[PDB]
Amino acid sequence: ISGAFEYSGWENFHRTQWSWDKKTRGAHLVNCTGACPHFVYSKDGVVMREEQSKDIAPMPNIPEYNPRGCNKGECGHDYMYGPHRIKYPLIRVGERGEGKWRRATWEEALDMIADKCVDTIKNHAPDCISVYSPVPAVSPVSFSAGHRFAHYIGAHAHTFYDWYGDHPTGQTQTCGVQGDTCETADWFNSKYIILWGSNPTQTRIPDAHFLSEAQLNGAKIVSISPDYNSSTIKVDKWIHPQPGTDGALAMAMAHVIIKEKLYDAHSLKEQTDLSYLVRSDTKRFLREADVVAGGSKDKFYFWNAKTGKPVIPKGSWGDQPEKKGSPVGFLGRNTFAFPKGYIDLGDLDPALEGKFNMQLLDGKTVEVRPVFEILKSRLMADNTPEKAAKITGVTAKAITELAREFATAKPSMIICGGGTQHWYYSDVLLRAMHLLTALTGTEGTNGGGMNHYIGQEKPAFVAGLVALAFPEGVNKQRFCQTTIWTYIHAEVNDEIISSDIDTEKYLRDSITTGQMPNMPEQGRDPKVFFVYRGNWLNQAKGQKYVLENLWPKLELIVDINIRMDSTALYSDVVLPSAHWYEKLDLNVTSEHSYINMTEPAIKPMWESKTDWQIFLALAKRVEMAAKRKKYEKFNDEKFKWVRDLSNLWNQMTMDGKLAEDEAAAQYILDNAPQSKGITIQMLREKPQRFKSNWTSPLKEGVPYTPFQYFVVDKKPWPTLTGRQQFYLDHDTFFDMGVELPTYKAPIDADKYPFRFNSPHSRHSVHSTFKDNVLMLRLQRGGPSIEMSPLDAKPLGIKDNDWVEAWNNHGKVICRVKIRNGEQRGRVSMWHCPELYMDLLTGGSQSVCPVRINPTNLVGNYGHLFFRPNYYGPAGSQRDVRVNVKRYIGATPISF
Amino acid sequence: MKAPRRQLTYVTDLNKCIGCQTCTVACKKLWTTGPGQDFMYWRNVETAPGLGYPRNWQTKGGGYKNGELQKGKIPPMIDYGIPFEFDYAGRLFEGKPGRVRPSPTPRSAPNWDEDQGAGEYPNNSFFYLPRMCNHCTKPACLEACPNEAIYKREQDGIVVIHQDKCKGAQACVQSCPYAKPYFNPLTNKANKCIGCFPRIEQGVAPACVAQCVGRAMHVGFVDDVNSSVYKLIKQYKVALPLHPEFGTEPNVFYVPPVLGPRIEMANGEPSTDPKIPLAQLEGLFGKQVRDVLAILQSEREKKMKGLASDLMDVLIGRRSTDMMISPLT
Ligand SMILES: Nc1nc2c(c(=O)[nH]1)N[C@@H](/C(S)=C(/S)[C@H](O)COP(=O)(O)OP(=O)(O)OC[C@H]1O[C@@H](n3cnc4c(=O)[nH]c(N)nc43)[C@H](O)[C@@H]1O)C=N2
Ligand SMILES: Nc1nc2c(c(=O)[nH]1)N[C@H]1C(S)=C(S)[C@@H](COP(=O)(O)OP(=O)(O)OC[C@H]3O[C@@H](n4cnc5c(=O)[nH]c(N)nc54)[C@H](O)[C@@H]3O)O[C@H]1N2
Ligand code: SF4
Ligand code: SF4
Ligand code: SF4
Ligand code: SF4
Ligand code: F3S
Ligand SMILES: [Mo]
């Protein structure tokens, strides 16, 4: 043979298929937590394919992150040329939801929105206009477009961290932080991992390799899931309790650890509140105001065994830090101003057990006890493994062995997710998970801690994002609490009686007293609704109440989208947004510590524009709608703000400095300590790692782990107690029976026999990629809902039959997948398919209402206060109970 | 047929495959975007146990007995699954009422039985089995082709069907026991996995390997003693070929799953048996899996005591280049 074989000439047919003339950096801007670096391959102006760039600089002795990516990302270019893409601005001509449109120019569509927006400010209020755009870390420039737009005209923004249920509500109650977790690389540093309500084989695909590689490196993994999920096939131990009974498993594990003295007593004396003295008369924390005249209500006492005297613990809410700092968004207070080693235990020896007598100003001595003492007495009585065995269905010896193993391995770490966070009582549940972590003393250690993983919810450079989104101040911006917002305007019946839990009482008292917001104010209806980067209608719990009650209240609903989703299908105007491979935007996550981005592979296709350029184009139309309607300046007394709508475009661009997409992206990086020094060109070449983080110092070659400013540097925790606070002595917490971590049985207000589960599927990123044709051919052609054969057999249900689920809130008809791994008495429908998919009626949200836990409404207890996505009602939905019936209107034979 | 100077070899780690179907999409979005290729998944992942893609391909026929060639069945199109098609534009843009249902009525699909497996709760068991063209040392397709259209390269051992010499005899589809050649009814030709030879000629791993998100795919030449493929197959001997009773000798290998919980007794306490039955790993890979599971089990116990185990370090692959031909592109 010469130098090329017999067939080298023809084989160029295959060599030409893997060819290109252009490669650019691309990212997929969906709420996925992936944020995986990709390259985009174009030829002749047509994007041909995408592939992971695999260019994350690895960390020493730990596996690298690459390739990352997933099955949805490797066909993300289908949304450039697929049948779902919005090409032109569309104006509804039929009824909402029919898909009957007329093509319109940008001018006509942007004038119509400008005409209605200026009308709403004039005749009603600016807070009757609102913009919903979720998770800014996914696309911070696109997030900032509509928010800066609403920022200057007076519209109110939304929350999403809690509305989705991603917000670790139990972590903000305990630690006083918005929410933090270690990056997934530190999963390799662990010896004992508990996958607790988390299915990372499907829900953490680009990061799931660290778990198996850890087990191949000596570690052990436990899976706590009622169903034998995809991830369970690799763990060493599988615990399957009844749905929602995990709190009884956690408290029984605390009992064993506390009974058998397995806990880290020193870590408990230094970093917790279990040594704080609680009065046996009022069940309250003993305070300095109770004992000393002019004493603080936000200062407390522990009993020091070294001196036999009570000592005021240092760094609580009443203790000020000499030289203050600016408020930090993800903290209840800025405890970083305190000096290093401030809460170092030193020579102190706080007593965890015992009874003591303290005497107050009023003359009377009162018996006080530490939090650890009251908790221990209740654990030994209520939370024995035998009693948890009868509640959870897990044997007492399996519960005991799990606790002994969790306390013995170092480091041990809990990885929780939606399976444990989307319940009505998930706050007290995560408090139980933080107690187990506090007992073992693994918080702040590589391979340990209580780690939560949800949506793409950590924009590390929040300061630069704040600058682009809310330039004149986050305190000069209106926010609604979207869980409250939906609940009220959609007139939801949550089926919970007022004599059991008076939700309306807790909700209204929280609002009229300023603890939680309710917009529009004065009881006005919402009138204008901007939806982009989120499928709000399709993902909204209480969806049937929303369609019937809230949706008619809106006069104009605008959807800016790359495709026609369910929200856009039921909208009044749909504007085409540019694909991810046609725009410039940043993209980060909490799963890894790098800044990813996307850049235009080609120009925006058809008449589409980028989100940043759309709101800039609308800003000039509103500038002229106000001119025409003679309403250019108006006084917004809430902020003493004489707004100028005639100069909206200059305020959107800082007099033109931020008129282009890359400029606003550079502005975000330039105004945050995590990213200053990084430019767009650096990110265009190679994914750059953050320069700092949130609750710990970022270290070269070491995976990040949170809370090390408090557990290592000994700065106070941003809680009322200054520590990891497990005793929450608020009236509303006593009313619910959760002043301490305990078991709260799930809600059974839906009088129906099947618990309704709706986990996240590996076959989509929420509603995105649900209608992807390749994804559907990788399943059974449409949505799915799973039953155990022990339930489908007495009902006459066969595999792939149509089944009918319903409660008092609505009804869904969907094809069933009978699965032996499914646990009897519960049904799992993969969450929120698009309404127009293979569903005979409604969707997964039709059977779900909106429910509000009163503990999530507290806004007057130290670190418990409303801040957008820091505290507020969680949008739980795992308590939903439905019935199942075989739909006999269509029974196709199989062959 | 001639023997190749080098034989490209794959190793799939069933202890790490998460079944996320990324390899399936990367292959389809690169090679099978052409006319008549909509139903063809050269790279496919399926749940074991299960019927696979196409349905019941393990009872199909092909490969070898007694040195003798068998002609199995040509799987009908329903066994591969009719690719579901949709009328989105009618509902979304053209005001046509009615859900966007799939056509035809769903009765079969490449991944129809995902995570159904076998065994009753709480002992249900399944795992994922990524399949592809085995690029066998004794390719039964090449042997059956009466036009000699198929050929095995001398440079890297890849088997490719020459699309100009192929006349649509479908004998390769009869005699392949893995059902990896697919007859294109629009070109009247057979299409098959090409082993990513345009990428390997440039020194880039195959797409299914390079884009493997679970970090479970291994690639290389078995003549190279520094390749993890060599160490897993030849040195530590934990990688086995799929269905060796077919007599074709595949060049893609599998490490049986050693991770997984144990069978749960009726009292909730664990026994010695894993949830994955050995009888099933035997049916897929023969009699050697019990010895291989012991080597893997033994070496993992070393790591659990904080000790060293080079076999584990090969499976872990802290650096991707220790796993495959350079995946950067
Ligand atoms: N019963 C039950 N209910 C549940 C859940 C459950 O577990 N159980 N899960 C929750 C949770 S946690 C979440 S995070 C929601 O599903 C999130 O849905 P979301 O609407 O934010 O994204 P999604 O992927 O759905 O849609 C994003 C939209 O934005 C489009 N898009 C994506 N990128 C862009 C862009 O760059 N620009 C613009 N203008 N649009 C873009 C996207 O096409 C889609 O329409 C909520 N419901
Ligand atoms: N491909 C893809 N990946 C994703 C997402 C996506 O949409 N698509 N969503 C991302 C985001 S926004 C989210 S919030 C996360 C969610 O992803 P996850 O953290 O995995 O949460 P879930 O999928 O809802 O449930 C996880 C498992 O816990 C089980 N479970 C249900 N109830 C309980 C319970 O009461 N106790 C216990 N111990 N287990 C229970 C569930 O059946 C499930 O098997 O994943 C993220 N990853
Ligand atoms: S989809 Fe989410 S995970 Fe899959 S690639 Fe795009 S970003 Fe990474
Ligand atoms: S990509 Fe790697 S992990 Fe995901 S399926 Fe293909 S092989 Fe298994
Ligand atoms: S796998 Fe089937 S097709 Fe590929 S070579 Fe071996 S026999 Fe021929
Ligand atoms: S190697 Fe190349 S061709 Fe063979 S399957 Fe993986 S991707 Fe498709
Ligand atoms: S037998 Fe040969 S002729 Fe083509 S259809 Fe098969 S390669
Ligand atoms: Mo989420």
Side-chain angles (χ1 to χ4, degrees), chain A residues 231-248:
Chain A
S231 306
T232 305
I233 74 177
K234 287 175 174 53
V235 308
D236 303 286
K237 175 122 58 185
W238 178 41
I239 307 295
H240 47 85
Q242 289 287 117
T245 65
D246 292 69

Side-chain angles (χ1 to χ4, degrees), chain A residues 164 535 539 560-561 565 580 611 758 767-768 845 877-878:
Chain A
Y164 293 150
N535 201 347
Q539 314 300 99
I560 306 160
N561 213 318
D565 59 7
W580 316 307
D611 293 341
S758 45
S767 66
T768 309
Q845 312 304 89
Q877 32 69 22
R878 296 299 157 98

Side-chain angles (χ1 to χ4, degrees), chain A residues 42-63:
Chain A
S42 309
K43 183 164 213 323
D44 304 313
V46 182
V47 161
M48 286 269 114
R49 59 184 298 272
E50 61 280 290
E51 181 171 346
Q52 304 102 305
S53 55
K54 320 175 201 74
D55 49 355
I56 282 183
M59 293 180 196
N61 314 313
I62 267 70

Side-chain angles (χ1 to χ4, degrees), chain B residues 22 34 39 91 214:
Chain B
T22 306
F39 82 101
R91 176 66 184 94

Side-chain angles (χ1 to χ4, degrees), chain A residues 7 11 41 49 51 54 59 62 64 66 97 99 217 226 234 236 240 762 777 817 836 838 893, chain B residues 17 84 91 95 99-100 107 114-115 119 121 151 165 199 211 215 264 300 303 319-320 327 329:
Chain A
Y7 293 130
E11 294 175 332
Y41 303 96
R49 59 184 298 272
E51 181 171 346
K54 320 175 201 74
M59 293 180 196
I62 267 70
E64 50 182 317
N66 327 286
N217 203 46
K234 287 175 174 53
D236 303 286
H240 47 85
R762 72 183 129 216
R777 291 173 187 171
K817 165 181 273 191
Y836 51 84
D838 205 14
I893 58 160
Chain B
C17 158
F84 299 128
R91 176 66 184 94
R99 73 197 198 280
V100 189
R107 295 190 168 94
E114 184 182 86
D115 303 339
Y121 195 102
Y151 68 99
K165 316 204 327 213
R199 291 172 69 104
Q211 312 186 229
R215 305 190 92 255
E264 173 180 326
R300 191 200 171 194
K303 286 281 193 173
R319 294 306 179 268
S320 299
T329 172

